C-alpha cells in the first residue's frame, strides 16, 4: 500500500536531527523509510543528486500537493537576502516557503528550527530565525532539543498518520506528551534537591552518590522536556543528568546556548 509522503529540507543544520533517526528503534530508520513513510526528499540519504534530486522534489511537491509532511532542521538565515544558505543557487528560505505551500503538516525538528537554537545565539552572525518566523500564516509543530529524542518526532508523525491530526500541543506548539512538563518536575534526583544533597564539583563525594546537579548549573528547573522519563537511545538509564552532567537547557529558548553550563537556573 501507499505510504504517507514526507519532504525533509535542511537549512542551517548540523545534521544531528537527521542522525537522531539512526538511534531510533520504534521505528528504526530502515522501517521508517520502507514501511512507515515515503521519504520523498532527504539530501542525506537520497541516491539522486543535483538536477535529479531537484527533479524528485518538484515531482513530489506536485504529486503530493496538500498531502505531505514538511520537516525542517536547522535555522533559516535571513540576513543579506538569504545568502548564508544557498541550495541550487537559491536561498533556502525560498525552498522552504515553496514546500510549505502544499504541506499537510509542518514540523520544525530540533531547537534550531523550533526557535533559532545555537545558530541564532550570541551576535547571530547570519540573522538566523525559526521556521515559524519564516512561515507566519502556518501552524508549525515544534519538536525542540539538540537533537530531540527521535521518537518525540516519530510519535508526532505517527499520531498524524494514525489518527489523522497532530498530537495535543502546548502554547509553543510543542507536543505535550514530550514537552508538557519541566524536567525538574519529573526528575529522579528531586529527593536530593529537596534534602540539600548536591554535587559541588564533578568527581566529588555527592556527585559519586548520584546527588542533584542544581549547583553544577542544571537547567532542569527551567526546561520543558521528557529527558528524565523517555531519556535517550532506549538502553535504559541514559540522559545527561543520569550520566553525571547538568541539563544545559538545550530544549528551551533563552536557556540552552545562552546561559553558561555552570550558571544557576531560576527555580519556580
Amino acid at each position: 500500500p501507499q505510504r504517507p509522503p514526507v519532504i525533509w529540507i535542511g537549512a542551517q543544520e548540523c545534521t544531528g536531527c537527521t542522525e537522531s533517526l539512526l538511534r531510533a528503534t520504534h521505528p528504526t530508520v530502515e522501517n521508517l523509510v520502507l514501511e512507515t513513510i515515503s521519504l520523498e526528499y532527504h539530501e542525506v540519504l537520497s541516491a539522486a543528486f543535483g538536477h535529479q534530486v531537484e527533479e524528485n522534489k518538484h515531482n513530489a511537491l506536485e504529486k503530493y500537493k496538500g498531502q505531505y509532511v514538511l520537516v525542517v532542521d536547522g535555522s533559516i538565515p535571513l540576513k543579506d537576502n538569504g545568502i548564508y544558505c544557498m541550495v541550487a543557487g537559491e536561498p533556502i528560505v525560498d525552498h522552504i516557503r515553496k514546500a510549505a505551500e502544499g504541506a499537510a503538516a509542518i514540523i520544525a525538528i530540533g531547537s534550531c528550527s523550533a526557535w533559532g537554537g545555537v545558530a541564532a545565539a550570541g551576535v547571530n552572525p547570519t540573522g538566523a530565525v525559526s521556521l515559524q518566523e519564516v512561515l507566519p500564516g502556518k501552524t508549525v509543530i515544534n519538536i525542540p532539543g539538540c537533537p530531540p529524542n527521535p521518537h518525540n518526532f516519530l510519535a508526532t508523525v505517527a499520531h498524524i498518520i494514525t489518527y489523522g491530526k497532530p498530537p495535543k500541543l502546548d502554547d509553543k506548539n510543542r507536543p505535550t506528551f514530550a514537552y508538557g512538563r519541566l524536567i525538574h518536575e519529573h526528575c529522579e534526583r528531586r529527593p536530593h534537591f529537596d534534602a540539600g544533597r548536591f554535587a559541588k564539583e564533578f568527581g566529588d563525594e555527592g556527585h559519586r552518590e548520584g546527588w542533584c546537579l542544581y549547583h553544577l548549573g542544571c537547567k532542569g528547573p527551567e526546561t520543558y522536556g521528557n529527558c528524565s522519563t523517555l531519556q535517550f537511545c532506549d538502553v535504559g538509564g541514559v540522559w545527561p543528568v543520569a550520566i553525571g552532567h547538568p541539563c544545559y537547557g538545550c530544549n528551551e529558548e533563552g536557556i540552552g546556548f545562552h546561559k553558561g553550563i555552570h550558571q544557576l537556573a531560576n527555580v519556580e
Binding site: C17, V44, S46, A47, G237, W239
Partner: protein, 551 residues
C-alpha cells in the same frame, strides 16, 4: 566540452556544490563550494572557556563528539591541565565507538549507492549471491534466505511506485559494474549495517549521556562519576552494559564491511588509478593513555611528496612544528581578510559577493601546512601508520588485499592507495583497528578502577588577567581536527576551528593552488554530463562534511 554544476551533492553532511568543466569526456577543472555558513566561531566568542565545548559540538552532528573533545582539549592546552587517565579512557571509548558508527554509515548509507544498482539486484539469484562469498566471509547473515528477504523488500518498494530515497538513482548507468548478485549482497549489508552502527552508538550513549551530542565532558576531564559500588552512577553494572555493546561490533566490521571494501575494489579496479587529491598528508596521534595528555595508541605524522620513508613523526599534541605550520587563507573564500592566517590570529569576517570562477566561490577557507596543500583523513592516517611501520595497520591492509587477490588474481601496491578506492580502504582499515582500541581502552579502564583510581575531573582555574593560547588536536573520522582558543581577561577572545573537511574541500588558496577535492577530480571520466556519477564517486570518498568544513 561544457560546464556542469552538481548542487546539491547528496549523501554527504551539509551543503555542497561541485562545478566541473568537462573536455573530451573528462573533467578538466573543478570547483568545490560550501554554500552554508553559521558563524560558529563568532557565536562562541566572549564566553567562559568552559562553555565552548557544548556550543561548538554543534558544528556537526554527524561527527558528533569530535568538536566537543577538541574544544575541551584546546581549553586544557591553554590552561595547562593534565587530564585524569580515567577521563582519557572514557573520551577514547566515546571517540572510537562514535567513529565506528560514522565510518559504517559512510560506506553504506552515504557511499554504496554510487557503486550499487538496486534495480539490478532484483535480477539476482540469491543462491548464486551467497555462493560467491564462500571462503571470502564467515558472516552469519549471507544466506540465500537472508538475501531473498532483502530482495523481496526491494521488490515491494519498487512495486509501490514510491521509491523515495531510491527514486531517480543512477540505475543502469554504464559506470555501474556490479553483477546483480553483488548488488543484492550490498543492499543486504546496507540494511545490516544499520544494526551495527546502532550498537556502536549505544556505547557512546552509555558514557556520553545520549548521542547525537554527548554531554559528559568538561574542561578538566569528564562528568561521569566512577563508583563501582554506587547507585545511579558509573558502576560495575553500567560498565558491563557498555562492554556488551562493544563486543557486538567486531563481527560485522570484520566479516562484512572489511570484505565489501575488497569486493568493491575487485569490481572497480580502475578506481585505484584515479582520484588522487594531494601529495602531502597529515594526521595527528590519537587515543592518549597517560596522565599527561600523551602516550597515544595511534601514531601521527606528516608525509611530503608521497614519501613514506622520510615522513616526519608527530607524537605530541604540543608539537611546535605541527602548530607553527598551520594557516588558512580566504583569497577564494567569502571572507574579508585574505592573507594566510595562523589560527590564533585568525579572523572570520563574512564578505559574500556571489560566485566567481576566478574570485571567491566558497564559505570554506583554504588551509595550508608550511604553504602546501594537504590531504587529511583516513588515507592520510593509514599512510602515516604504514610509514611508522605499525604492524596492526600493515596486517589489516594485507587482509583486504588478500580478499582482493582471491577475487581478481591481482595484488595492490601502496602506489595504488593514492586514489579514490585507496581512500575508502584507509577508512575501512581505521574502522577495523578501532575495534582493538575499544577492547584495549575498556580493559584499561576496568584495570585502573580496580587499582583504586576513581578520579575523573580536575577543576580548572582561569586567571582573570593575561592572554593564554591553546590548541586541541584530534584525529577525527574525516582527519586532523584542531580548535584554537585564545583566552584574554578570563574569556574567549578568539576561537578558530580548522576542520578536516576544511583541508580537503577548501577552494583554491592564496597562491591559487588546488586543494584535494578539486585536484582529485581532474581526469575523471564522465560518460553522461547530465548524470555525473563518476564525480560524486570521488567526492564521496573523502566523506565530505560541510557543516564541519565551514562552521
Amino acid at each position: 566540452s561544457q560546464r556542469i554544476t552538481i548542487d546539491p551533492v547528496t549523501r554527504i553532511e551539509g551543503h555542497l556544490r561541485i562545478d566541473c568543466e568537462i573536455e573530451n569526456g573528462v573533467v578538466s577543472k573543478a570547483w568545490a563550494s560550501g554554500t552554508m555558513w553559521r558563524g560558529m566561531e563568532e557565536i562562541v566568542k566572549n564566553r567562559d572557556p568552559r562553555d565552548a565545548w557544548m556550543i561548538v559540538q554543534r558544528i556537526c552532528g554527524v561527527c558528533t563528539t569530535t568538536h566537543a573533545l577538541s574544544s575541551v582539549r584546546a581549553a586544557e592546552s591553554a590552561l595547562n591541565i593534565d587530564v585524569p587517565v580515567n577521563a582519557q579512557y572514557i573520551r577514547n571509548i566515546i571517540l572510537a565507538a562514535h567513529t565506528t558508527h560514522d565510518h559504517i554509515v559512510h560506506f553504506y548509507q552515504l557511499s554504496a549507492l554510487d557503486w550499487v544498482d538496486i534495480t539490478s539486484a532484483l535480477q539476482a539469484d540469491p543462491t548464486k549471491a551467497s555462493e560467491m562469498l564462500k571462503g571470502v566471509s564467515t558472516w552469519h547473515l549471507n544466506s540465500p534466505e537472508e538475501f531473498t528477504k532483502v530482495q523481496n523488500k526491494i521488490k515491494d518498494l519498487v512495486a509501490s511506485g514510491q521509491l523515495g530515497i531510491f527514486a531517480n538513482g543512477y540505475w543502469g548507468h554504464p559506470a555501474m559494474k556490479l553483477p546483480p548478485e553483488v548488488n543484492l549482497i550490498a543492499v543486504a549489508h546496507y540494511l545490516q549495517a544499520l544494526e551495527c552502527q546502532r550498537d556502536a552508538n549505544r556505547v557512546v550513549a552509555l558514557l556520553g549521556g545520549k548521542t547525537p551530542h554527548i554531554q559528559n565532558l568538561a574542561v578538566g576531564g569528564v562528568a561521569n562519576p566512577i563508583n563501582l559500588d554506587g547507585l545511579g552512577v558509573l558502576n560495575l553494572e553500567r560498565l558491563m552494559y557498555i562492554k556488551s555493546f562493544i563486543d557486538k561490533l567486531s563481527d560485522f566490521v570484520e566479516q562484512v564491511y572489511k570484505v565489501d571494501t575488497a569486493v568493491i575494489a575487485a569490481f572497480y579496479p580502475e578506481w585505484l588509478t584515479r582520484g588522487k587529491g594531494a601529495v602531502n598528508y597529515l594526521s595527528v596521534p590519537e587515543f592518549p593513555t597517560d596522565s599527561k595528555n600523551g602516550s597515544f595508541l595511534f601514531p601521527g605524522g606528516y608525509i611530503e611528496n608521497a614519501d613514506l620513508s622520510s615522513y616526519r613523526p608527530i607524537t605530541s599534541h604540543s608539537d611546535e612544528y605541527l602548530i607553527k605550520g598551520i594557516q588558512e587563507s580566504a583569497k577564494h573564500s567569502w571572507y574579508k581578510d585574505e592573507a594566510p592566517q595562523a589560527p590564533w590570529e585568525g579572523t572570520t569576517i563574512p564578505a559574500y559577493d556571489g560566485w566567481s570562477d576566478d574570485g571567491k566561490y566558497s564559505w570554506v577557507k583554504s588551509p595550508t601546512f608550511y604553504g602546501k596543500t594537504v590531504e587529511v583523513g583516513p588515507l592520510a592516517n593509514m599512510l602515516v601508520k604504514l610509514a611508522a611501520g605499525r604492524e596492526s595497520t600493515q596486517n589489516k591492509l594485507n587482509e583486504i588485499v588478500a580478499i582482493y587477490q582471491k577475487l581478481t588474481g591481482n595484488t595492490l601496491e601502496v602506489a595504488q592507495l593514492h586514489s579514490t578506492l585507496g581512500r575508502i580502504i584507509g577508512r575501512t582499515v581505521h574502522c577495523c583497528e578501532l575495534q582493538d582500541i575499544l577492547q584495549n581502552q575498556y580493559s584499561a579502564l576496568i584495570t585502573n578502577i580496580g587499582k583504586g583510581d576513581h578520579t575523573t575531573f580536575v577543576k580548572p582555574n582561569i586567571p582573570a588577567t593575561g592572554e593564554f593560547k591553546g590548541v586541541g588536536f584530534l584525529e577525527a573520522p574525516r582527519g586532523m581536527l584542531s580548535h584554537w582558543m585564545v583566552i584574554k581577561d578570563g574569556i574567549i577572545s578568539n576561537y578558530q576551528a580548522v576542520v578536516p573537511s576544511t583541508w580537503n574541500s577548501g577552494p583554491r588558496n592564496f597562491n591559487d593552488d588546488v586543494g584535494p577535492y578539486e585536484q582529485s577530480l581532474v581526469g575523471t571520466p564522465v560518460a553522461d554530463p547530465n548524470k555525473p556519477l563518476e564525480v560524486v564517486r570521488t567526492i564521496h570518498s573523502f566523506d565530505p562534511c560541510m557543516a564541519c568544513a565551514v562552521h
